[PDB]
Structure formats: structure tokens, C-alpha cells
Amino acid sequence: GYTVAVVGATGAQMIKMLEESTLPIDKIRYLDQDITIEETTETAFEGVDIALFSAGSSTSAKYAPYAVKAGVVVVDNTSYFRQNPDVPLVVPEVNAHALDAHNGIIACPNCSTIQMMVALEPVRQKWGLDRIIVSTYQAVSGAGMGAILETQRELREVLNDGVKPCDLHAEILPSGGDKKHYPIAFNALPQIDVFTDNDYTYEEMKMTKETKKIMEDDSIAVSATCVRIPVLSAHSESVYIETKEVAPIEEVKAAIAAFPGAVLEDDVAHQIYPQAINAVGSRDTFVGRIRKDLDAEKGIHMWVVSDNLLKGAAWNSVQIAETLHERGLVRPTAELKFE
Amino acid sequence: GYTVAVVGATGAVGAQMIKMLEESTLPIDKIRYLASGKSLKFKDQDITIEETTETAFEGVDIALFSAGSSTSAKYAPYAVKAGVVVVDNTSYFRQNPDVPLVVPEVNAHALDAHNGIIACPNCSTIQMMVALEPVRQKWGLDRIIVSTYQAVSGAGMGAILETQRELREVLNDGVKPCDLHAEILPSGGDKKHYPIAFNALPQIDVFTDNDYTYEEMKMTKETKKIMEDDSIAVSATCVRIPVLSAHSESVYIETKEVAPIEEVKAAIAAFPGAVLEDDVAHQIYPQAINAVGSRDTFVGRIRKDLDAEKGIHMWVVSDNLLKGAAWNSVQIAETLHERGLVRPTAELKFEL
């Protein structure tokens, strides 16, 4: 069996998914049994078969190249390697084949991107994909624990202490790497991550760039609006697509229902649609509100929801590791392509 | 001056109507409040509430309705027969061809041919029309795709109290969101109810036969009527989120002519009732919590689509109780007066 290391174990969801994995694990190392935390160093990866990184991009950039040198296969959570052409950017249900050519690092994609890809791939493979327009409804746990705690503090201030939302002091949201901070309580902030020079944020541009790489098609037009709302866990997305050929809605529903990792929750006669609160704790991606555009013959709207820490992060990383194992790809890399 | 009546004066809906009227420039000589002996203020005066009836509209020049559909269907026609001009708040008359559906900054000219009832549009639709009309008049509009982020105050006071209760049960008593009991949201008149706290519910109003909801279809049909162009393609997704007041909207358009973003920004900034909040260098964009209490519609995140040459995305926010309802209605009354249109209608076109 494998020696699996979790870098950034202090991270919790990574551990839980690994406890329930079908991966054959002889030894766990953190860098119902107590495990000592070892320091992350350049020589700490000897004998490790698989390393799941769940620290920041700084930890991945420095140490992931040394893991590959030592013979490890790295699954990186961060954004640092996602647009490196020597690194596969993988959602196992969509593009597992891209794992075959790996050079020791497989990047886990952005959370909002992953769930959209699970929903849209079954549609793409039957009727094609020309464009995507998405507006997201993203939970604060995407911005980390500090954001979660801030959201709860703000809500308690409003509800128990009578503070008006606009008078709340904030220190993290919308972004811990930007100059100004605004309340999320009873609000919708149309900013995730910081702005780029084309007036889309990095989150929005990640949905564009990562979609193109995952589906291996630069011709798919993608434009996104990414919005933070007062939800702790689970991202929701209003997704619009135009297919290459007309996809009957009955057949779209059937295709999504059969697709691994996706659950059709779509029965409007009984008010059944995906909901954030229902998706928490589950590995699945829930899809519904599926219907034709009222004017464009090839347009389709839908509503997509998933736990942003599971399929959106920790589960996708562990599932990649399971797929690596299934495909015979857990082994040392010959040529080192990272400094 | 005018005799003005507020029909449904005791609502939380009626309260906002009263507030806007109190701040109006409309020359009011007499105010009357109609509902189901009690007292409510108008400015410095105590006004005695009277019962809404078929005969309660005599001598009234303008009636602002602020109740429900049943009250408008039943009593608005009798107001017209009594010589009143009615501004109706509900959806009941919006799609009637004899009834102007008006956002004063957009289609005030449609008021001129009124037959005694002008309908206030749906809140989510109004703010979209304020943001998009300055763009349409310079570059045209071919299509719209909208995804909304709607506050619970649009479903009424009960929906607000339910949202606050659910949130307190989670944060104060440690109840899990999926263990919450809901009675109203997403829709009081539908069979099943779900928690809104820490949730996003993609249902506003009930489902129609085409699997869009009524809220979504209202955005489609009302847009077509207001802009007087059935060729504008409009599709919507309407979602409720844990916000008490102010709707936000992610809006995508395609214009008929390429509209330079700097010019689109300037056009919206110059348009009455719209405020440009767009400076991403200093993280300036519209926010629900900032819009509460203002009559303005705020527009930002304006940017070209990454691929479609005539595509534009933006972010539109306004207080759903003010421009989305009570202020649009009072503004219609002010505009009727402005244009010399407060008059009895000779021919009754609505069934009693």
C-alpha cells in the first residue's frame, strides 16, 4: 500500500475524505489514531507515494518540485500550477485521460469551476458546447475560516445588537488580499478575489481559463460574474449555455442523471431543485431548474450546487488520487520539469 | 390640490407608500386611508382609516393601491367609475392592453393614453429597466439574460420575520440549517416551504407550465411591454437569498450596435434615477446594504463580454420597497400630474 502525506494538515476535509477513501493506505503522514506533525522540508518527502497539498500557493511552489524529485505524485489544491502546460488540471469525471501524461503534479481546479464542469460535460459530449455565461452565488468558506467567522459575527451583531448592515465593521471579505473590506451580512458582494486589468476578477477569469483547459477547447466562450452571498457552505450557480446542436431537455436531464458525480434534482411540480443547505456534506454535484431559453433555440439554463469544500476542493483532490491509483499512474516521474 | 387615497394603508407595504407620499411634491389637499376607525399619521396629522368599499372613492382624484391582487381586481374598477386615476401596485392589471405599465424614466409617454389605471411593474423588472434604457436609446437592445439575487422583504413582513427567526435559531441556539422549520419561503401560496437561512432558493412565486416561475416570466413580459418591443429576447432566473432589503441583478445584454464601455458608463450616469457606482480600482460597485433607503438604481461591474462583440455584463441594485414598489408608484402619480393627466375617464373599460 501507499504512504500518503497531507501538506497543510492543520486540510480537515482532506483528512475526512482520506479516511473514507478506497485508496490502499499503509501510512499517513501530516506535514482514530494520533499522528505527529512533521515539518515540511526539502528532504521530508522520501518514501511518500502521494502528497495532497492543502496549504497556500507559497508552500506548493517551493516544496512540490522537491516532492517530485523524491518520487512523489503531487495533487495540488492551489492555483499556482493550474496554467502550467506540464501540469494536468483535472476533474476525474471529465478529463481523467489528461492524468496519463503527468510530470508529478496534478492541479485541482477552482471550486466554482469543478461543479460547473461536472454538470456541463454530459451535455457537451452529446450536443457540444459553444458558450457559457454563469452568475455564481458563492459561500464564504471559499474565502477560508476567517471569512466564515466574520460572517457569523456580523450576522449576530445585526440580529442581537441591532446594528444596521451598512454600519458593520469588516476586515476580510470580499478579499483578504485587497485594500477595502465590506460586510457580507444581508448583502451580495459582486467581488471574489481581486480585479485584473480587464475589469473581471481573478475568480471570474479562472472560470474562463480553467474551463478551456479542462475541456481542452479554447473555442468555448466563457464569461462569469462571481458573487459572494451570506451562505457558509456550498456554491450555487445560475448557468447558461448554448450547445452546438439542439439538445432536447428530456435528454439533457437523462444525460445529467446518468453522469457520474452528478445528481438530477429537478422536479418543479414538487418544488425539487438543488439547494446549498441540502448539498452540504455530500460529494455530489446537484443540477436542476433545467429548461430551454425562451428565444435562442440552442440555449439552456440550469442551477448547479455542490459543497465547495468537498467536490469543490478536498474530495476532488482525493478522487484524483484514487483515479491515479486506478489508472496505474502512482509512480516516480523520470524528468524533472519544476525548479 | 388633489384628494389622494392610499388603499391598503395598514400594510408594511402601505407604510412605505405613506412614507414616499409624505416626501412627495404632489399638491395634496386631502388624504384618505382605506383598509379592512384606527389611526395612522400623514405628516403631522392623524388620519382615520376607513373601510375599502365600492362607494369609498367619491371625490378622490388619485388612488395608490398597496394591498393584494384581490383588492385591486375588486375595487380599482369602482374607483375608475367614480372618476379616480388609479396607480396599482399588483400584477393584476400589468398585462391588460388598456393599462399602461410604467417606469417614469423609461416610458412616461405611455401614460398619455391611460384609461384610469396605470400599473406599477414588478420590482426586479423596474430596476433592470432604469439601468438598461439609457443603453437601449443609444445602441439598442437585442437580448437580455438575468440572474437575480432577491431580498425577502419582497415576500412581505412575514418572510422577513421568518428569515430573522431562522438565522437566530442557527446562530443563537445552534440549530442546523436543514433542521429549520419554514412556513412561508420560497412562496406562501405554494405547497412546500424551505429554509432561507444560509441558503439560496431558485424559486420566486410559483412554477408556470414552461418550467420558468411567474417571477421570471414577469421580467420577460413586463420588459417587452415597458420598452414596447416584443422582439427583445429576455430570459431570467430568479433566486431568493438571505438579504432583508434590496435586490441585486447580474445582467447580460447584447446591444444592436457596439456600445463602447466608457460611453455606456457615461450614459447610465447621465440617466435620471440611475447612479453609476463603478470604479473597480477602488472596489466600487453596487451593494444591497448600501442601496437600502435610497430611491436610486445603482449600476456597476460594467464590462464587455469576453467573446460576443456586442455583449455587456453589469450589476444592478435597488431597494425593492422604494424604486421597486412604493417610490415607482408615487413617481407615477407625480408624472401623471406633471403631464396634466389626472382626470376622470369617461369610458369604463374594466369589468365591475
PDB file of C-alpha atoms in Angstrom, chain A residues 89-209:
ATOM      1  CA  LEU A  89      -5.825  20.340 -14.472  1.00  0.00           C
ATOM      2  CA  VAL A  90      -8.302  17.594 -13.667  1.00  0.00           C
ATOM      3  CA  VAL A  91     -11.894  16.839 -12.718  1.00  0.00           C
ATOM      4  CA  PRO A  92     -11.828  12.988 -12.780  1.00  0.00           C
ATOM      5  CA  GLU A  93     -15.285  12.575 -14.384  1.00  0.00           C
ATOM      6  CA  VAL A  94     -14.482  14.994 -17.230  1.00  0.00           C
ATOM      7  CA  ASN A  95     -10.824  14.619 -18.249  1.00  0.00           C
ATOM      8  CA  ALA A  96      -9.211  11.639 -16.461  1.00  0.00           C
ATOM      9  CA  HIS A  97      -7.184  10.941 -19.649  1.00  0.00           C
ATOM     10  CA  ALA A  98      -5.086  14.081 -19.013  1.00  0.00           C
ATOM     11  CA  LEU A  99      -3.598  12.279 -15.985  1.00  0.00           C
ATOM     12  CA  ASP A 100      -1.711   9.822 -18.243  1.00  0.00           C
ATOM     13  CA  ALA A 101       0.856  12.425 -19.300  1.00  0.00           C
ATOM     14  CA  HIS A 102       1.554  13.899 -15.837  1.00  0.00           C
ATOM     15  CA  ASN A 103       5.006  15.040 -14.722  1.00  0.00           C
ATOM     16  CA  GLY A 104       4.457  14.617 -10.981  1.00  0.00           C
ATOM     17  CA  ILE A 105       1.958  17.406 -10.315  1.00  0.00           C
ATOM     18  CA  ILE A 106      -1.789  17.290 -10.932  1.00  0.00           C
ATOM     19  CA  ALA A 107      -3.638  20.537 -10.177  1.00  0.00           C
ATOM     20  CA  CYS A 108      -7.078  20.530  -8.580  1.00  0.00           C
ATOM     21  CA  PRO A 109      -9.239  23.164 -10.333  1.00  0.00           C
ATOM     22  CA  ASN A 110     -11.056  26.139  -8.768  1.00  0.00           C
ATOM     23  CA  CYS A 111     -14.150  25.174  -6.712  1.00  0.00           C
ATOM     24  CA  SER A 112     -16.802  27.029  -8.759  1.00  0.00           C
ATOM     25  CA  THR A 113     -15.280  25.630 -11.974  1.00  0.00           C
ATOM     26  CA  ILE A 114     -15.356  21.996 -10.843  1.00  0.00           C
ATOM     27  CA  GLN A 115     -19.108  21.739 -10.174  1.00  0.00           C
ATOM     28  CA  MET A 116     -19.941  23.536 -13.450  1.00  0.00           C
ATOM     29  CA  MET A 117     -17.748  21.056 -15.341  1.00  0.00           C
ATOM     30  CA  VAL A 118     -19.498  18.067 -13.739  1.00  0.00           C
ATOM     31  CA  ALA A 119     -22.887  19.480 -14.808  1.00  0.00           C
ATOM     32  CA  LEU A 120     -21.923  20.532 -18.338  1.00  0.00           C
ATOM     33  CA  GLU A 121     -19.669  17.689 -19.554  1.00  0.00           C
ATOM     34  CA  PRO A 122     -22.535  15.159 -20.078  1.00  0.00           C
ATOM     35  CA  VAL A 123     -24.248  17.836 -22.187  1.00  0.00           C
ATOM     36  CA  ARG A 124     -21.050  18.655 -24.143  1.00  0.00           C
ATOM     37  CA  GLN A 125     -20.340  15.040 -25.125  1.00  0.00           C
ATOM     38  CA  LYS A 126     -23.825  14.577 -26.683  1.00  0.00           C
ATOM     39  CA  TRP A 127     -24.583  18.061 -28.141  1.00  0.00           C
ATOM     40  CA  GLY A 128     -21.399  20.149 -27.900  1.00  0.00           C
ATOM     41  CA  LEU A 129     -20.713  23.459 -26.185  1.00  0.00           C
ATOM     42  CA  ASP A 130     -20.252  26.864 -27.798  1.00  0.00           C
ATOM     43  CA  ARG A 131     -20.705  29.335 -24.941  1.00  0.00           C
ATOM     44  CA  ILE A 132     -21.224  29.633 -21.192  1.00  0.00           C
ATOM     45  CA  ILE A 133     -22.494  32.543 -19.156  1.00  0.00           C
ATOM     46  CA  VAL A 134     -22.501  31.954 -15.423  1.00  0.00           C
ATOM     47  CA  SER A 135     -23.504  34.024 -12.394  1.00  0.00           C
ATOM     48  CA  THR A 136     -22.423  32.477  -9.093  1.00  0.00           C
ATOM     49  CA  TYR A 137     -23.805  32.525  -5.578  1.00  0.00           C
ATOM     50  CA  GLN A 138     -20.744  31.526  -3.582  1.00  0.00           C
ATOM     51  CA  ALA A 139     -20.363  30.629   0.093  1.00  0.00           C
ATOM     52  CA  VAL A 140     -17.898  32.364   2.411  1.00  0.00           C
ATOM     53  CA  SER A 141     -15.973  29.186   3.354  1.00  0.00           C
ATOM     54  CA  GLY A 142     -14.358  29.547  -0.070  1.00  0.00           C
ATOM     55  CA  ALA A 143     -12.505  32.536   1.429  1.00  0.00           C
ATOM     56  CA  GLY A 144     -11.425  30.374   4.407  1.00  0.00           C
ATOM     57  CA  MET A 145     -12.178  30.014   8.128  1.00  0.00           C
ATOM     58  CA  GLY A 146     -11.624  33.707   8.937  1.00  0.00           C
ATOM     59  CA  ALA A 147     -14.361  34.648   6.460  1.00  0.00           C
ATOM     60  CA  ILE A 148     -16.773  32.126   7.997  1.00  0.00           C
ATOM     61  CA  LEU A 149     -16.176  33.534  11.485  1.00  0.00           C
ATOM     62  CA  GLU A 150     -16.553  37.134  10.252  1.00  0.00           C
ATOM     63  CA  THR A 151     -19.887  36.308   8.586  1.00  0.00           C
ATOM     64  CA  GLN A 152     -21.304  34.820  11.779  1.00  0.00           C
ATOM     65  CA  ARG A 153     -20.010  37.754  13.854  1.00  0.00           C
ATOM     66  CA  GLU A 154     -21.647  40.291  11.531  1.00  0.00           C
ATOM     67  CA  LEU A 155     -24.979  38.424  11.491  1.00  0.00           C
ATOM     68  CA  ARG A 156     -25.027  38.198  15.304  1.00  0.00           C
ATOM     69  CA  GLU A 157     -24.285  41.949  15.550  1.00  0.00           C
ATOM     70  CA  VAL A 158     -27.261  42.777  13.311  1.00  0.00           C
ATOM     71  CA  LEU A 159     -29.658  40.281  14.883  1.00  0.00           C
ATOM     72  CA  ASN A 160     -28.771  40.584  18.609  1.00  0.00           C
ATOM     73  CA  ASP A 161     -27.232  44.075  18.914  1.00  0.00           C
ATOM     74  CA  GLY A 162     -29.367  45.976  16.378  1.00  0.00           C
ATOM     75  CA  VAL A 163     -26.511  47.155  14.147  1.00  0.00           C
ATOM     76  CA  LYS A 164     -27.533  48.167  10.604  1.00  0.00           C
ATOM     77  CA  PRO A 165     -25.716  46.038   7.989  1.00  0.00           C
ATOM     78  CA  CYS A 166     -24.157  49.130   6.338  1.00  0.00           C
ATOM     79  CA  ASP A 167     -22.561  50.167   9.690  1.00  0.00           C
ATOM     80  CA  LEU A 168     -20.812  46.808  10.284  1.00  0.00           C
ATOM     81  CA  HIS A 169     -17.001  46.713  10.522  1.00  0.00           C
ATOM     82  CA  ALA A 170     -15.409  44.085   8.262  1.00  0.00           C
ATOM     83  CA  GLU A 171     -11.766  43.024   7.910  1.00  0.00           C
ATOM     84  CA  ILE A 172     -11.628  40.094   5.407  1.00  0.00           C
ATOM     85  CA  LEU A 173     -14.416  39.995   2.784  1.00  0.00           C
ATOM     86  CA  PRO A 174     -14.653  40.447  -0.097  1.00  0.00           C
ATOM     87  CA  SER A 175     -10.899  39.625  -0.254  1.00  0.00           C
ATOM     88  CA  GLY A 176      -8.088  39.378   2.310  1.00  0.00           C
ATOM     89  CA  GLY A 177      -5.648  40.449  -0.412  1.00  0.00           C
ATOM     90  CA  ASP A 178      -7.431  43.729  -1.252  1.00  0.00           C
ATOM     91  CA  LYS A 179      -7.454  47.188   0.322  1.00  0.00           C
ATOM     92  CA  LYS A 180     -11.087  47.622   1.291  1.00  0.00           C
ATOM     93  CA  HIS A 181     -13.455  45.371   3.200  1.00  0.00           C
ATOM     94  CA  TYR A 182     -17.252  45.322   3.228  1.00  0.00           C
ATOM     95  CA  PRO A 183     -19.910  43.472   5.231  1.00  0.00           C
ATOM     96  CA  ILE A 184     -21.399  40.263   3.813  1.00  0.00           C
ATOM     97  CA  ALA A 185     -24.294  40.099   6.313  1.00  0.00           C
ATOM     98  CA  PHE A 186     -27.587  40.605   4.454  1.00  0.00           C
ATOM     99  CA  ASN A 187     -25.542  41.573   1.381  1.00  0.00           C
ATOM    100  CA  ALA A 188     -24.360  40.336  -2.017  1.00  0.00           C
ATOM    101  CA  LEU A 189     -20.798  41.351  -2.903  1.00  0.00           C
ATOM    102  CA  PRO A 190     -20.000  41.126  -6.640  1.00  0.00           C
ATOM    103  CA  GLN A 191     -16.265  40.555  -5.945  1.00  0.00           C
ATOM    104  CA  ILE A 192     -14.388  37.319  -5.358  1.00  0.00           C
ATOM    105  CA  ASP A 193     -10.587  37.573  -5.400  1.00  0.00           C
ATOM    106  CA  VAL A 194      -9.049  40.800  -6.747  1.00  0.00           C
ATOM    107  CA  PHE A 195      -9.557  42.557 -10.079  1.00  0.00           C
ATOM    108  CA  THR A 196      -7.450  42.011 -13.181  1.00  0.00           C
ATOM    109  CA  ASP A 197      -6.747  44.705 -15.784  1.00  0.00           C
ATOM    110  CA  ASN A 198      -9.778  43.677 -17.959  1.00  0.00           C
ATOM    111  CA  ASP A 199     -12.256  44.504 -15.098  1.00  0.00           C
ATOM    112  CA  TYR A 200     -13.136  40.863 -14.407  1.00  0.00           C
ATOM    113  CA  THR A 201     -11.846  39.444 -11.116  1.00  0.00           C
ATOM    114  CA  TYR A 202      -9.357  36.589 -10.929  1.00  0.00           C
ATOM    115  CA  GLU A 203     -12.168  34.234  -9.870  1.00  0.00           C
ATOM    116  CA  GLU A 204     -14.182  35.067 -12.987  1.00  0.00           C
ATOM    117  CA  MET A 205     -11.122  34.726 -15.233  1.00  0.00           C
ATOM    118  CA  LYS A 206     -10.274  31.391 -13.577  1.00  0.00           C
ATOM    119  CA  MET A 207     -13.722  30.044 -14.585  1.00  0.00           C
ATOM    120  CA  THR A 208     -12.934  31.162 -18.168  1.00  0.00           C
ATOM    121  CA  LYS A 209      -9.345  29.886 -18.405  1.00  0.00           C
TER     122      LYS A 209
END
